[PDB]
Amino acid sequence: TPGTMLFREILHGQLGYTEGQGVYNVVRSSEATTRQLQAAIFHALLNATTYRDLEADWLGHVAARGLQPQRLVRRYRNAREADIAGVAERVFDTWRNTLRTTLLDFAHGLVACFAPGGPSGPSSFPKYIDWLTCLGLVPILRKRQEGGVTQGLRAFLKQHPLTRQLATVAEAAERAGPGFFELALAFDSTRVADYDRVYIYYNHRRGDWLVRDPISGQRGECLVLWPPLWTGDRLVFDSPVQRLFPEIVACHSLREHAHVCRLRNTASVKVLLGRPYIPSYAQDLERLSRLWEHELVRCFKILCHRNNQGQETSISYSSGAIAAFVAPYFESVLRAPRVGAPITGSDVILGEEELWDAVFKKTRLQTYLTDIAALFVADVQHA
Amino acid sequence: TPGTMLFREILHGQLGYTEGQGVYNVVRSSEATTRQLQAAIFHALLNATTYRDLEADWLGHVAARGLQPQRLVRRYRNAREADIAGVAERVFDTWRNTLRTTLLDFAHGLVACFAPGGPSGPSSFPKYIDWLTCLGLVPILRKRQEGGVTQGLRAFLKQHPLTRQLATVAEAAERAGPGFFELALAFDSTRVADYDRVYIYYNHRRGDWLVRDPISGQRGECLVLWPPLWTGDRLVFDSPVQRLFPEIVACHSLREHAHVCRLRNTASVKVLLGRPYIPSYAQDLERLSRLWEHELVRCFKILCHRNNQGQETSISYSSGAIAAFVAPYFESVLRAPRVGAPITGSDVILGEEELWDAVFKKTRLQTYLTDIAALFVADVQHA
Amino acid sequence: TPGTMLFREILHGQLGYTEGQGVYNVVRSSEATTRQLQAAIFHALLNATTYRDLEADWLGHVAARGLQPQRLVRRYRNAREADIAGVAERVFDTWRNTLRTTLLDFAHGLVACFAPGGPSGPSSFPKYIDWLTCLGLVPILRKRQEGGVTQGLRAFLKQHPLTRQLATVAEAAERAGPGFFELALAFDSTRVADYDRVYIYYNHRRGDWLVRDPISGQRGECLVLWPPLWTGDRLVFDSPVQRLFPEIVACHSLREHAHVCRLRNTASVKVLLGRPYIPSYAQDLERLSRLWEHELVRCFKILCHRNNQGQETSISYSSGAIAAFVAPYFESVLRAPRVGAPITGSDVILGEEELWDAVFKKTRLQTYLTDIAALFVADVQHA
């Protein structure tokens, strides 16, 4: 019993502390998962590139604006003036604005990110993985139930098309709507496990290693091993948190042993009745601080941008980890394989409009809408 | 009881101090939230880009100025002189001034920022979060009541359209007015909790962890856990302020222990009746000063601009935190999901006219007004 | 009682001193507030950009000069000579001079800056805030009375239009005159509190924290908390001046303890009747000097320009503070929300003609006067 209690506590730095122990906190960050959720919600909404959508919005834009070019050619009167340089700019810029119309949809991607990320019942996802990487194993509390948050996502959607310009744009999105609606349920219907309430270290006798939760709520449901654990008739477990353990106790003992001796060493003159002092730990705290620093950066594949002159540390989550750790923690927990695209270590730098550039770099309908709009416009002024 | 008292006090540096402890004060800054409030109030006012607004101001500008171009063409008499280079500059610059008319609206964004930011009852928002990050938990004192400040926001608005040029501009804004008016209430109607008056560490016995306020004012309302707390039949709590605690006491003891011995060591010659001194703490204050420095910068994602030659520290709040910490502290407290746009670490550099550039870079009506004004002007001089 | 006495004194360096303690003096500077007052008085005077003002001065300039261009065209006789390059320069430069006419107004902005800044009764404003930041709280002595200084501002104004060129320019300013006149009263009618005469640390028993002044002059009026104070049945108060306190006393004790021992150590040979010395404080004064240096620069957001080769310190007040500290100390004391524009850390570099460039960069009427003057001139020489 006490070890699995202790290995949670010693990562918490109950006893001793070094500088490197704080670098775990960047692994505890939720930055990657929000980027993954925000790119997740993108692709399903970008998919419908139909002729009927792109015209009926633009042909609707034709009549109220007066876009028939016979009215325009009278105004120009000039072969010298490039009328396309007039019109096609005015085709693009006002339809740059419909990316911001698509940004008016985007807040569901914000809400259904903090629908797990925000509240207390399910925490933010990768907050939970770092207990799992602490112990070296994953419990999952799988149940179908509790779709209650996504109803607030439903009445969210009926509020938006007030202009009615939004609806004909989002008609392509609402045919993808149950495509989006089902994916919103799946993580939000699942329950991720609770660290103390689940019991560990209680298996069957080597026929398999299988430990389940006892609690008055439920029994245990699923176990996921990214490392397995090594039993030599004795529980020894793979973790980075194992790799601290024999030295930290030797560190913590050394801090404790030199400390007690100093209090006894507070005596002026030795009293002898006839009828050397070495409390020192200065180097070893420095060694351990370097140790746990270099340990953790390789373990979870952390990207430490070191500046010229070796000083500035721009800390970020590397791209190699983000396909190796997020997506298994994503997909094996999510079970919906629609979100398949990994996104670069470039992405963590990027803000949300850059994500729209990342939308625009995927060019799903983006370049496709621009060309056929530009083509059908251009030659009419050439005529 | 005394620990939650103490962990507030030890962050306050009751006992001992290091250089890094002062770097908490930049986390205590309110710089991000004012930037978020100032960008918040922007988008709702920028939204109405209707043909009727953009013309009736300009067509009103047509007659009193005498803008019918038949009067102008007599003056020019010159195909060589680009009359558009005359007129369209004079279209733009005087309608650059209507951005400053929009800046005459802006002071409501200033007042409703210090309407929470200024007074004593609700403090500035992120002043409160740093007690919450001190303890690792959030109490919220949620009540509908007390909309008293926003009435001063109402009589604020009736004072402005004195020129009556402002009103026809702000008619588009006053249809967005109840859009703005309701959002001004929501944070201003809520009450953020009080640190000592709320009681902590008093829960139910592991069926849930739930502690509420006793006070003669109200009972406790809401609890928000960004970390949860780790009970091993014993309250151990996740915080950065936990991570100081075992070493600071060992620091503070070391400062206390070496101090007392020196006073006893103020004796000239030992008096022996027949019938070694080690008070030293010089290194360990330096280690702890580096420790808490490197701890805090990773914890809340702080941006430390280190110059060439490693010396100049331009301290600022990084963009990764500002989407990870402000917006949950914003939205879960605010409950109004309209303000969805995060803003860069670029923004903290920027002043308010740069925010108007940030308004102008969003191009909501900004480029849209300029084009149709420029188009309808240009070809008439071409004729 | 003695602590609030002492915390004023210990910032004053009654006991001990370090290099960093002198860096408080730049926080005690009044440089920002004069820049804010000088930009304050600008915008109200710049606002009136009416057609009637800009013409009746220029059309008045037309007749006495003889500006009707039929007289000029005889002189030029040359299509080669750009007559606009003659005339429009002479339109601009002599109306560059009316910026210096506007500078002849400017001395009221100088007087009503040292009308609080100069005399003994109200001191310069941010001299007072640094006592408030010393203790961590603000008393305000709010009374309507004593508008006596602004009468000298009134007879100031009747002296100026001697040329009568000034009056028709300042007619636009004197319609803004009661706009300026009322704002001059508000800070000058208020009284900012007095440090010893106001009593502190005397509240009501936790139902609120509320302390008022007893003095034979008045009672206490207002209290403003930028931090609140932390009572654990014991007054502990948030301040930067709190953060010096436990270590400075340990510093001051260390300086006192090693000092006394040295005087006793002035004995040649120990006298023994039968029938080790460690006074050392060299490092700890250096640590504290670095401590209070790095503490204060982050606390009030101070800008320390460090040169190449790390040596030159151009000390100035940063732009982040100047929107976070000046304006609350401005507006919550002033109560007149007209002055809403914050001004950059660029501004503290700038002198007053650069402020006129800052006037000119706002382009309120500045570019607007220049264009319609240049337009109506130009084509007549083209004719």
Side-chain angles (χ1 to χ4, degrees):
Chain A
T1 57
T4 311
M5 177 61 68
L6 186 139
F7 278 94
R8 192 180 294 110
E9 292 173 353
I10 193 163
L11 172 67
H12 192 65
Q14 172 187 1
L15 49 97
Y17 207 76
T18 59
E19 177 186 354
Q21 295 298 327
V23 193
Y24 188 82
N25 202 356
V26 189
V27 191
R28 194 174 168 180
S29 304
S30 68
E31 183 65 30
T33 55
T34 62
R35 293 297 187 272
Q36 291 300 315
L37 285 178
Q38 280 178 350
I41 297 163
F42 279 160
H43 297 170
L45 304 177
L46 301 171
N47 199 7
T49 178
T50 70
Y51 293 83
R52 294 177 180 88
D53 287 324
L54 50 90
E55 288 301 321
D57 300 339
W58 169 256
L59 298 174
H61 178 70
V62 164
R65 178 64 178 86
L67 202 144
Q68 289 299 109
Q70 58 181 355
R71 297 172 181 174
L72 301 173
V73 171
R74 296 176 177 177
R75 296 180 178 179
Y76 291 115
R77 186 61 62 189
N78 288 315
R80 289 182 175 92
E81 296 295 325
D83 310 336
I84 173 169
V87 176
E89 289 180 349
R90 295 188 295 272
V91 180
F92 177 66
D93 301 330
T94 65
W95 291 89
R96 175 170 283 175
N97 276 316
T98 52
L99 280 76
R100 308 301 188 272
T101 282
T102 317
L103 180 57
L104 185 55
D105 296 335
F106 171 76
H108 64 272
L110 190 66
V111 173
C113 180
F114 292 97
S120 62
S123 80
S124 294
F125 284 169
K127 303 290 185 285
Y128 274 149
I129 195 179
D130 287 322
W131 177 63
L132 308 171
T133 62
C134 178
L135 184 49
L137 56 95
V138 177
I140 297 168
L141 196 61
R142 186 176 300 271
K143 284 293 180 71
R144 182 70 65 85
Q145 295 179 356
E146 298 290 324
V149 181
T150 63
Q151 297 297 319
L153 290 169
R154 288 181 62 188
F156 182 82
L157 298 174
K158 300 293 183 179
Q159 291 169 351
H160 289 290
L162 182 65
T163 67
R164 294 292 192 268
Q165 182 180 2
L166 304 171
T168 174
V169 175
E171 276 179 349
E174 72 193 4
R175 305 296 176 89
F180 168 65
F181 175 72
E182 292 167 353
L183 303 174
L185 290 168
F187 61 96
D188 204 357
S189 67
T190 51
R191 182 80 179 185
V192 196
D194 293 336
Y195 55 95
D196 280 335
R197 286 180 178 175
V198 172
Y199 289 184
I200 332 289
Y201 46 77
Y202 181 74
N203 52 348
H204 303 88
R205 296 178 179 89
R206 303 293 188 268
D208 275 329
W209 179 74
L210 289 171
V211 183
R212 297 166 67 92
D213 188 8
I215 199 178
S216 63
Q218 292 181 7
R219 65 187 180 273
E221 301 297 322
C222 288
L223 56 88
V224 169
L225 291 175
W226 171 69
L229 309 182
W230 293 354
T231 63
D233 294 333
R234 176 64 58 85
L235 294 174
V236 182
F237 64 94
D238 294 336
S239 72
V241 181
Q242 183 73 56
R243 292 174 177 97
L244 67 89
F245 178 66
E247 188 166 357
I248 299 288
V249 177
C251 167
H252 172 71
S253 66
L254 182 67
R255 184 184 290 179
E256 285 292 330
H257 289 300
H259 174 70
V260 175
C261 293
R262 191 181 73 252
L263 293 176
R264 181 67 170 176
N265 205 6
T266 59
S268 61
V269 179
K270 299 304 292 184
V271 175
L272 291 177
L273 301 177
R275 59 185 63 185
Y277 289 100
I278 49 166
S280 60
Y281 58 94
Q283 291 173 353
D284 292 327
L285 287 183
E286 196 274 329
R287 183 182 68 205
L288 189 71
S289 61
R290 187 181 295 113
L291 182 73
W292 182 256
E293 175 75 29
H294 276 282
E295 171 69 28
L296 182 143
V297 59
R298 294 179 179 87
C299 180
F300 301 97
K301 303 296 292 296
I302 312 297
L303 184 56
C304 294
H305 291 284
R306 301 295 304 277
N307 195 1
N308 290 313
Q309 297 295 318
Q311 181 55 46
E312 189 273 333
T313 64
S314 295
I315 311 297
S316 67
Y317 187 76
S318 173
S319 184
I322 205 169
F325 288 92
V326 176
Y329 181 73
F330 194 73
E331 288 288 326
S332 298
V333 176
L334 176 66
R335 305 283 186 182
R338 176 59 60 192
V339 184
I343 301 96
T344 326
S346 175
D347 194 78
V348 187
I349 310 162
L350 299 175
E352 284 182 354
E353 294 289 322
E354 290 81 357
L355 302 176
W356 287 107
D357 178 74
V359 167
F360 183 73
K361 287 186 293 189
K362 287 182 180 288
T363 70
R364 191 168 300 275
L365 45 88
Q366 299 290 317
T367 59
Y368 176 64
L369 301 192
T370 56
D371 300 336
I372 52 180
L375 170 68
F376 183 73
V377 163
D379 298 335
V380 184
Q381 300 95 27
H382 287 297
Chain B
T1 57
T4 311
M5 177 61 68
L6 186 139
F7 278 94
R8 192 180 294 110
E9 292 173 353
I10 193 163
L11 172 67
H12 192 65
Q14 172 187 1
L15 49 97
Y17 207 76
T18 59
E19 177 186 354
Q21 295 298 327
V23 193
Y24 188 82
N25 202 356
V26 189
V27 191
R28 194 174 168 180
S29 304
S30 68
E31 183 65 30
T33 55
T34 62
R35 293 297 187 272
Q36 291 300 315
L37 285 178
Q38 280 178 350
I41 297 163
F42 279 160
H43 297 170
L45 304 177
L46 301 171
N47 199 7
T49 178
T50 70
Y51 293 83
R52 294 177 180 88
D53 287 324
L54 50 89
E55 288 301 321
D57 300 339
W58 169 256
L59 298 174
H61 178 70
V62 164
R65 178 64 178 86
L67 202 144
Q68 289 299 109
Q70 58 182 355
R71 297 172 181 174
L72 301 173
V73 171
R74 296 176 178 177
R75 296 180 178 179
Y76 291 115
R77 186 61 62 189
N78 288 315
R80 289 182 175 92
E81 296 295 325
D83 309 336
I84 173 169
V87 176
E89 289 180 349
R90 295 188 295 272
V91 180
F92 177 65
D93 301 330
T94 65
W95 291 89
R96 175 170 283 175
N97 276 315
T98 52
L99 280 76
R100 308 301 187 273
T101 282
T102 317
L103 180 57
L104 185 55
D105 296 335
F106 171 76
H108 64 272
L110 190 66
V111 173
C113 180
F114 292 97
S120 62
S123 80
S124 294
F125 284 169
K127 303 290 185 285
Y128 274 149
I129 195 179
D130 287 322
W131 177 63
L132 308 171
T133 62
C134 178
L135 184 49
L137 56 95
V138 177
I140 297 168
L141 196 61
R142 186 176 299 271
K143 284 293 180 71
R144 182 70 65 85
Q145 295 179 356
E146 298 290 324
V149 181
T150 63
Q151 297 296 319
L153 290 169
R154 288 181 62 188
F156 182 82
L157 298 174
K158 300 293 183 179
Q159 291 169 351
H160 289 290
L162 182 65
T163 67
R164 294 292 192 268
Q165 182 180 2
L166 304 171
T168 174
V169 175
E171 276 179 349
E174 72 193 4
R175 305 296 175 89
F180 168 64
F181 175 72
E182 292 166 353
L183 303 174
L185 290 168
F187 61 96
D188 204 357
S189 67
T190 51
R191 182 80 179 185
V192 196
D194 293 336
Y195 55 95
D196 280 335
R197 286 180 178 175
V198 172
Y199 289 184
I200 332 289
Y201 46 77
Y202 181 74
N203 52 348
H204 303 88
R205 296 178 179 89
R206 303 293 188 268
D208 275 329
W209 179 74
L210 289 171
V211 183
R212 297 166 67 92
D213 188 8
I215 199 178
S216 63
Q218 292 181 7
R219 65 187 180 273
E221 301 297 322
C222 288
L223 56 88
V224 169
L225 291 175
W226 171 69
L229 309 183
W230 293 354
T231 63
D233 294 333
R234 176 64 58 85
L235 294 174
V236 182
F237 64 94
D238 294 336
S239 72
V241 181
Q242 183 73 56
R243 292 174 177 97
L244 67 89
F245 178 66
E247 188 166 357
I248 299 288
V249 177
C251 167
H252 172 71
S253 66
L254 182 67
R255 184 184 290 179
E256 285 292 329
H257 289 300
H259 174 70
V260 175
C261 293
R262 191 180 73 252
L263 293 176
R264 181 67 170 176
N265 205 6
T266 59
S268 61
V269 179
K270 299 304 292 184
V271 175
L272 291 177
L273 301 177
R275 59 185 63 185
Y277 289 100
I278 49 166
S280 60
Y281 58 94
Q283 291 173 353
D284 292 327
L285 287 183
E286 196 274 329
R287 183 182 68 205
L288 189 71
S289 61
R290 187 181 295 113
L291 182 73
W292 182 256
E293 175 75 29
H294 276 283
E295 171 69 28
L296 182 143
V297 59
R298 294 179 179 87
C299 180
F300 301 97
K301 303 296 292 296
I302 312 297
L303 184 57
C304 294
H305 291 284
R306 301 295 304 277
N307 195 1
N308 290 313
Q309 297 295 318
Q311 181 55 46
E312 189 273 333
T313 63
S314 295
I315 311 297
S316 67
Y317 187 76
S318 173
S319 184
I322 205 169
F325 288 92
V326 176
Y329 181 73
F330 194 73
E331 288 288 326
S332 298
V333 176
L334 176 66
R335 305 283 186 182
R338 176 59 60 192
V339 184
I343 301 96
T344 326
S346 175
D347 194 78
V348 187
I349 310 162
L350 299 175
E352 284 182 354
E353 294 289 322
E354 290 81 357
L355 302 176
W356 287 107
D357 178 74
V359 167
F360 183 73
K361 287 186 293 189
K362 287 182 180 288
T363 70
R364 191 168 300 275
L365 45 88
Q366 299 290 317
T367 59
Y368 176 64
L369 301 192
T370 56
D371 300 336
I372 52 180
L375 170 68
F376 183 72
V377 163
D379 298 335
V380 184
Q381 300 95 27
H382 287 297
Chain C
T1 57
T4 311
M5 177 61 68
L6 186 139
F7 278 94
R8 192 180 294 110
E9 292 173 353
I10 193 163
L11 172 67
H12 192 64
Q14 172 187 1
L15 49 97
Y17 207 76
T18 59
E19 177 186 354
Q21 295 298 327
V23 193
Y24 188 82
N25 202 356
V26 189
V27 191
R28 194 174 168 180
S29 304
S30 68
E31 183 65 30
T33 55
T34 62
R35 293 297 187 272
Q36 291 300 315
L37 285 178
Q38 280 178 350
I41 297 163
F42 279 160
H43 297 170
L45 304 177
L46 301 171
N47 199 7
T49 178
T50 70
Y51 293 83
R52 294 177 180 88
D53 287 324
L54 50 90
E55 288 301 321
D57 300 339
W58 169 256
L59 298 174
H61 178 70
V62 164
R65 178 64 178 86
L67 202 144
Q68 289 299 109
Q70 58 182 355
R71 297 172 181 174
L72 301 173
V73 171
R74 296 176 177 177
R75 296 180 178 179
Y76 291 115
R77 186 61 62 189
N78 288 315
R80 289 182 175 91
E81 296 295 325
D83 310 336
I84 173 169
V87 176
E89 289 180 349
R90 295 188 295 272
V91 180
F92 177 66
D93 301 330
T94 65
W95 291 89
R96 175 170 283 175
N97 276 316
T98 52
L99 280 76
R100 308 301 188 273
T101 282
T102 317
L103 180 58
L104 185 55
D105 296 335
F106 171 76
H108 64 272
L110 190 66
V111 173
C113 180
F114 292 97
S120 62
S123 80
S124 294
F125 284 169
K127 303 290 185 285
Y128 274 149
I129 195 179
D130 287 322
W131 177 63
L132 308 171
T133 62
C134 178
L135 184 49
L137 56 95
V138 177
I140 297 168
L141 196 61
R142 186 176 299 271
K143 284 293 180 71
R144 182 70 65 85
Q145 295 179 356
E146 298 290 324
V149 181
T150 63
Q151 297 297 319
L153 290 169
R154 288 181 62 188
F156 182 82
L157 298 174
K158 300 293 183 179
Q159 291 169 351
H160 289 290
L162 182 65
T163 67
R164 294 292 192 268
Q165 182 180 2
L166 304 171
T168 174
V169 175
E171 276 179 349
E174 72 193 4
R175 305 296 175 89
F180 168 65
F181 175 72
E182 292 166 353
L183 303 174
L185 290 168
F187 61 96
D188 204 357
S189 67
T190 51
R191 182 80 179 185
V192 196
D194 293 336
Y195 55 95
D196 280 335
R197 286 180 178 175
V198 172
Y199 289 184
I200 332 289
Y201 46 77
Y202 181 74
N203 52 348
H204 303 88
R205 296 178 179 89
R206 303 293 188 268
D208 275 329
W209 179 74
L210 289 171
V211 183
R212 297 166 67 92
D213 188 8
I215 199 178
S216 63
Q218 292 181 7
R219 65 187 180 273
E221 301 297 322
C222 288
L223 56 88
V224 169
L225 291 175
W226 171 69
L229 309 183
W230 293 354
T231 63
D233 294 333
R234 176 64 58 85
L235 294 174
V236 182
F237 64 94
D238 294 336
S239 72
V241 181
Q242 183 73 56
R243 292 174 177 97
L244 67 89
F245 178 66
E247 188 166 357
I248 300 288
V249 177
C251 167
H252 172 71
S253 66
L254 182 67
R255 184 184 290 179
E256 285 292 329
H257 289 300
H259 174 70
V260 175
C261 293
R262 191 181 73 252
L263 293 176
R264 181 66 170 176
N265 205 6
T266 59
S268 61
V269 179
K270 299 304 292 184
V271 174
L272 291 177
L273 301 177
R275 59 185 63 185
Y277 290 100
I278 49 166
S280 60
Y281 58 94
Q283 291 173 353
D284 292 327
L285 287 183
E286 195 274 329
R287 183 182 68 205
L288 189 71
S289 61
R290 187 181 295 113
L291 182 73
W292 182 256
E293 175 75 29
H294 276 283
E295 171 69 28
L296 182 143
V297 59
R298 294 179 179 87
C299 180
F300 301 97
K301 303 296 292 296
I302 312 297
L303 184 56
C304 294
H305 291 284
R306 301 295 304 277
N307 195 1
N308 290 313
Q309 297 295 318
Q311 181 55 46
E312 189 273 333
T313 63
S314 295
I315 311 297
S316 67
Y317 187 76
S318 173
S319 184
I322 205 169
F325 288 92
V326 176
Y329 181 73
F330 194 73
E331 288 288 326
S332 298
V333 176
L334 176 66
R335 305 283 186 182
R338 176 59 61 192
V339 184
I343 301 96
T344 326
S346 175
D347 194 78
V348 187
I349 310 162
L350 299 175
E352 284 182 354
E353 294 289 322
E354 290 81 357
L355 302 176
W356 287 107
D357 178 74
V359 167
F360 183 73
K361 287 186 293 189
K362 287 182 180 288
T363 70
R364 191 168 300 275
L365 45 88
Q366 299 290 317
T367 59
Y368 176 64
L369 300 192
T370 56
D371 300 336
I372 52 180
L375 170 68
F376 183 72
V377 163
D379 298 335
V380 184
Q381 300 95 27
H382 287 297

